[PDB]
Design a protein around this ligand. Structure first.
Ligand SMILES: [Mg+2]
Ligand SMILES: [Mg+2]
Ligand SMILES: [Mg+2]
Ligand SMILES: [Mg+2]
Ligand SMILES: [Mg+2]
Ligand SMILES: [Mg+2]
Ligand SMILES: [Mg+2]
Lengths: 138, 48, 59, 164
RNA sequence: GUCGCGGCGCGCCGAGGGCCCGACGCCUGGCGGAGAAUCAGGGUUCGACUCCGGAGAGCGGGCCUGCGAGACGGCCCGCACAUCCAAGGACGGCAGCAGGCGCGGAACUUGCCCAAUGCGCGGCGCGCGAGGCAGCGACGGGGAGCGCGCGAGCGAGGCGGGCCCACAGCCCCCGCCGCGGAGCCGAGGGCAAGCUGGUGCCAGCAGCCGCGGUAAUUCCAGCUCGGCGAGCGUCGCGCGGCGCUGCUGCAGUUGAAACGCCCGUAGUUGGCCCCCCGCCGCCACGAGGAAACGGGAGCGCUCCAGGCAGGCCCGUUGGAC
RNA sequence: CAUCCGGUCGAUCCUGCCGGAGCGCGACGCUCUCCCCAAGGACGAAGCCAUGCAUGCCCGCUCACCGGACGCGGCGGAC
């Protein structure tokens, strides 16, 4: 009918699928190569960087920081979620930055933020916000 | 102005639950053998 | 309750002396065990000896 | 490389695709109560075993009765099931296998045979006795609660001759 | 010339070969296969690493010995690094085992021994960072346990003896004394699980919808409760979810989508009929060719993850397929 | 071992995407009673290397010393 169905027509089917499977946004983003080069994390679970400045229908200002990745030298912003953790981060402190739940895209009402802060001076943020450990060495 | 401005009772020293499998046994008599529903404020008024 | 093992009965002691893992002989009341020497020092000695030339009985 | 690299290994249990489902939770708790089960990995192991049996039975059933592979595999499966006691002796058709349930698996546990012999006051009492090493399966003492007993040894599970 | 065929090299002659059934060129964070992950069936992604094969030993070349090497724990040269010098000279290649610097989100002892499995030499043995044993080890997988009962019992733990071990441990057996310990998430819906005090669109929560502008069922604390469990949660990737890549098995009037129309080559598709011959496809059987993994017959490592054992009067005990 | 759920509206049915629910591979945080098996500097740095070790053996050739040295020779070092 619309599609080919002859007994000697596998080549055309393979070619058609090869051509048409590039139309999916997800497949493109995963197999095209542009995102991997444009992603400052280069496919890594999380990165180690250096902070350099603190900044911050809902009308609540969210606290974040500007960071520069050691291995990449490009600039990004990562947002420190847990309450009272602004004071736990000081200018020019080594940090480890991961991603939000949605890879690539922004999450929530925060404009222009796509990362998270999970470690400072080598201590997990969660372990410090609950007072399990302490940052007396810095 | 000061973050953490919003962020005392002594803990009520009561015996620990029976851990292990006994915890399951504790639930078994909790609702089936012992009278139930759960969640009303007035129910806690009975408990107090 | 149950323990199983293997035996080994030899016709004469000399046959045993010839045919018997050495450490088994030490475990049994057969021979005394001299103090072993670490193979590391042997290797070092062999290398140093290989270094020198001609007559090397010195070390 | 080391010889340790050739040692095989695999898992033995599965987890439900939908975790939060009230009827399943209640049924699993009820089964734990009637069998005094520790955690929920044992039920998963039981379901794994049952799934294997059912899949084998299905594959054999699709084939013809006079298929040599069918005869061989069905005979082996029936012999194993009967020797375990999970399936009744009077049944020897592969069709009956599909109707088996995990409860029949539970009934052949060491605690089960211990209790139905009236040797113990309860499943929990049976487990605690098993731990202390007062039981001589066959002629050998066993301290594994989940040890499964075959038919030929059910009459031979006794109290340890060494226990106080 | 080569062990040797050959444009392999040279001389002469002719012109030719490949291509939409995709040449040539460019890219690859490209070793390949046996296989791994996922799960109705059809499939998608990965395949450094255990076994087989290929290539390399800082980059690029050359060569001797030898049956066998264009070898690097063999030599010579150039290049880039490096070291010692009583300054004239000399010397080096851990992608071998440990160890160190750097890098990164990311990965262990500068231990003992050839007793086992094999290799070289050789007669009653030697050597082997191959290989084995131990140390660290929540990548991870399997088996038990923080009680039962109105009192007894029993673990882990220590002290000594066995057994085992190249020596030591460790499992297990035996006598004496006998530490009982659960955390990680969440309670509006998806999604199983509710009481006061604070703050007031601030601070904050929130994968999505949303909460918070005075009862906040969602933030911060207490009580209570739920899930899993010696494990729990977070981040990124792959499979499934997905009949949202559709061969099985999508849609195309109006949601995104029938070229403005005709001719037409490669390509794909082609009515009916002959009773037995030959050829292609097709179906079944068979040979031949590696194991491990996978499936699977049998065997109570106390069960199990596993392993190919083991009992006495064993198919020639078995390890089938 | 053939499964779905919430979100466009004043309400309703669709298309369509977003998010949730499982498995595996790794990294991070918390925590940890006992036993058994067990991977372990591969992740666009085939980057750089102190220290120590990783290939020797012996049948022939003894006026060497009191035959064991050493060296010639053979095998191997292309596994
Ligand atoms: Mg490459
Ligand atoms: Mg290889
Ligand atoms: Mg080579
Ligand atoms: Mg070379
Ligand atoms: Mg080298
Ligand atoms: Mg070499
Ligand atoms: Mg349209």
């Amino acid at each position: 009918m619309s599609k080919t169905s002859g007994l000697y027509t596998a080549r055309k089917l393979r070619t058609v699928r090869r051509v048409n499977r590039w139309a999916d946004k997800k497949y493109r983003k995963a197999h095209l190569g542009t995102w991997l080069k444009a992603n400052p994390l280069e496919g890594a679970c999380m990165a180690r960087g250096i902070v350099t400045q603190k900044i911050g229908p809902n009308s609540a200002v969210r606290k974040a920081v500007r960071v520069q990745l050691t291995k990449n030298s490009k600039k990004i912003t990562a947002f420190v979620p847990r309450d009272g953790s602004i004071t736990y981060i000081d200018n020019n402190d080594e940090v480890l930055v991961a991603g939000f739940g949605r890879a690539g895209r922004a999450v929530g009402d925060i404009p222009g933020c796509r990362f998270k802060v999970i470690k400072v001076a080598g201590i997990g943020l969660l372990a410090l916000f609950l007072r399990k450990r302490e940052k007396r060495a810095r | 102005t000061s973050a953490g401005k919003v962020r005392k009772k002594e803990k009520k020293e009561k015996p620990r639950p029976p851990r292990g499998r006994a915890y399951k046994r504790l639930l078994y008599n909790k609702n089936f053998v012992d009278d139930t529903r759960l969640g009303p404020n007035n129910l806690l008024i009975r408990q107090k | 309750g149950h323990t199983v093992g293997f035996c080994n009965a030899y016709q004469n002691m000399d046959a045993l002396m010839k045919y018997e893992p050495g450490f088994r002989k030490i475990r049994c009341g057969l021979i005394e065990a001299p103090k072993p020497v670490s193979r590391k020092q042997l290797k070092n000695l062999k290398n140093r000896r290989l270094k020198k030339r001609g007559t090397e009985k010195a070390t | 490389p080391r010889i340790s690299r050739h040692r095989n290994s695999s898992k033995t249990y599965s987890t439900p695709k939908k975790p939060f489902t009230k009827p399943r939770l209640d049924a699993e708790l009820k089964l734990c109560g009637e069998y005094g089960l520790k955690c929920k990995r044992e039920i998963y192991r039981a379901r794994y075993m049952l799934a294997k049996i059912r899949r084998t039975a299905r594959n054999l059933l699709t084939l013809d009765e006079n298929d040599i592979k069918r005869r061989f595999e069905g005979a082996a499966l029936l012999r194993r099931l009967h020797m375990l006691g999970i399936l009744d002796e009077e049944k020897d058709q592969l069709d009956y296998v599909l109707g088996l349930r995990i409860e029949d698996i539970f009934k052949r546990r060491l605690q089960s045979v211990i209790v139905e012999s009236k040797l113990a006051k309860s499943v929990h009492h049976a487990r605690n006795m098993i731990k202390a090493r007062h039981i001589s399966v066959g002629g050998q003492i066993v301290n594994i609660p989940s040890y499964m007993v075959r038919i030929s040894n059910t009459s031979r599970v006794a109290i340890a001759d060494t226990s106080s």
